[PDB]
Amino acid sequence: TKCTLKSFTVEKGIYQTSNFRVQPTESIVRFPNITNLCPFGEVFNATRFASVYAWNRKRISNCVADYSVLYNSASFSTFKCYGVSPTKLNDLCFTNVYADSFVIRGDEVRQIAPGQTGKIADYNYKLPDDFTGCVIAWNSNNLDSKVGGNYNYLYRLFRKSNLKPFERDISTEIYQAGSTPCNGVEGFNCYFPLQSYGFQPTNGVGYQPYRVVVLSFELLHAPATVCGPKKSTNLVKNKCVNFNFNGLTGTGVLTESNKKFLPFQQFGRDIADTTDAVRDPQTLEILDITPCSFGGVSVITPGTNTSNQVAVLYQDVNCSNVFQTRAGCLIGAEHVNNSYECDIPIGAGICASYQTSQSIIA
Amino acid sequence: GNYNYLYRLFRKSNLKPFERDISTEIYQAGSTPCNGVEGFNCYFPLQSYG
Amino acid sequence: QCVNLTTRTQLPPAYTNSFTRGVYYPDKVFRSSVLHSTQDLFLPFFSNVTWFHAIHVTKRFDNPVLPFNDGVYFASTEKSNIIRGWIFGTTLDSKTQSLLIVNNATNVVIKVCEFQFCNDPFLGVYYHKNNKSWMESEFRVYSSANNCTFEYVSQPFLMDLEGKQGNFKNLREFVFKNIDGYFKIYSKHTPINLVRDLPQGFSALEPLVDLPIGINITRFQTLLALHRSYLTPGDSSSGWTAGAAAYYVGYLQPRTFLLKYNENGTITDAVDCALDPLSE
């Protein structure tokens, strides 16, 4: 009251200082109720992949992506994401998820990077300079390398020009370098582009074939349909907690409702055009919002010169000498049966004074 | 090649203003935790220049 | 281009009037016992629409290409499910992504692809005499389909494929809107019972789907179906039977209404804010 009035002598009367608010305790976050999963079980683990000049393109659409289903059934060697952090793949959504699967040698993995040089990145699969995606490579000496010798994987050696990004070139014709055009004689200046690899199990780990799958996507472009995973919480009711219902941020007591809605729309507003009810998006239950920020505080004094004790008036509060009036909850003052003349006005026909060892009576 | 200067690239948390960070720990990116051996998904926080 | 149908006596169109249609909810929130005013793509009260006939039982088969404006209200009066599907696009020459929404008797196929349409797209079923079965025989929609961006295949079901004659007993209501590329389709079925024209009444509308395309649709067309039977002379170039149905197309324009909400929170009465100064 002294720091409210900015004085040192407080006169007899009722004064207003602050407001009583109740803080939230927990914070529940909903959203996942849709059980669809993208087919990761054929991208990182297949019976037989394709060559580097003829990579397989798979379109991922109309599902929900996940990151924790990648490190529970498959062990990798190289995992690098260009243009995006690997820990930001859960909150952020994705657009146009394309997978390019090809098998190269262990010495060609470092050449697959957005901005390198060499042979493979210029003649087989061109990466963009402003590439945004992840590169996943792992060793597979199980199916790609035959014990009798696998030579089905081929690579392009001779070509006229370079390649554009996201371009596939398949050709089995004889390359021509100078004069004397060939059309197949296997002579001078008659080059065959598709050459065989050297994938043998008797060599070292660098000559083993490596499966490389490149995931490319877009960020903040187009109406998306495939987003990442989302963590879910539980449901708590009859408590003033913070929550988030379908993007709407609300904090309060979620009491049970007695009205039913129609099964196509979600939220609810009252006569005052403010939020009074909300349907639970996981359990399909109507919950009425009411926050726990109600009431103010008022201080009753008989005067600084009279005494140093107060009575404290709580305005919209249901309830030492705790007494509930029709105007509110009064603490620090006792209710008496006797009716005196009114000294300090309170509300709803209650007045406080300083009578008789003497205290403040109401 | 002048590779005598380094910078911090991977860190778990951010930094306050007017504070210098000296000690570096092995950063973990997702699963397979390192615990000071730097195996899989264990990137180094200090990287050289070009 | 492609082959066409002959002996098509196309009647001139007639202009008729609609009576308080196209009243749907503002958004995804319920309000109760409160009067609230918005600005969405509506039909104004007592507007003039265009009536297109499809009755042959005579010699009427007209299905022109309509340009897609800012919201198209579509009410369909059927008795034997004559209207099958819809196509959407700009030029329809396998160079622009085209939306094809068809309601086949087996599956609901929605494809956003690069299709090649002919001059007169239609459907056709064949009815046998020795056996009572409706099979789809003539499918004269496209020549080839190479490029695609989207495909939506639903569950298999069974429909009777009725070809009876009489009075109208279905009212199919489709509301097509585009806000920021989201294709918003709204469905309502009403068991009406009257001979012809448009019935009168007041009702609210229910959502169907919000399919998120990102293409620019300029024109659209509605495809019909033909019954080939013993009444045909014996050829598909001149012998046809469209049936007997009527469809009403109205273009949406942004008005302003005041909506009255009951204790259940549904649309009960709508007041046009500029029709006359009493309602103003």
Numbering used by the authors:
A (entry chain B): 299 to 617, 640 to 676, 689 to 694
B (entry chain A): 447 to 496
C (entry chain C): 14 to 70, 76 to 298
Quote the study on this structure.
Finally, analysis of the spike/Sb#68 complex dataset revealed two distinct populations. The most abundant class showed an 1up/2down conformation without sybody bound, which is identical to the one obtained for the spike protein alone. Cryo‐EM map of S‐6P, with an 1up/2down RBD conformation. No densities for Sb#68 were observed. Structural comparisons revealed that Sb#68 cannot access its epitope in the context of the 1up/2down conformation, due to steric clashes with the neighboring RBD. Sb#68 cannot bind to up‐RBD if the neighboring RBD exhibits a down conformation due to steric clashing. In order to bind, at least two RBDs need to be in the up conformation. Without sybodies, the spike protein predominantly assumes an equilibrium between the 3down and the 1up2down conformation.
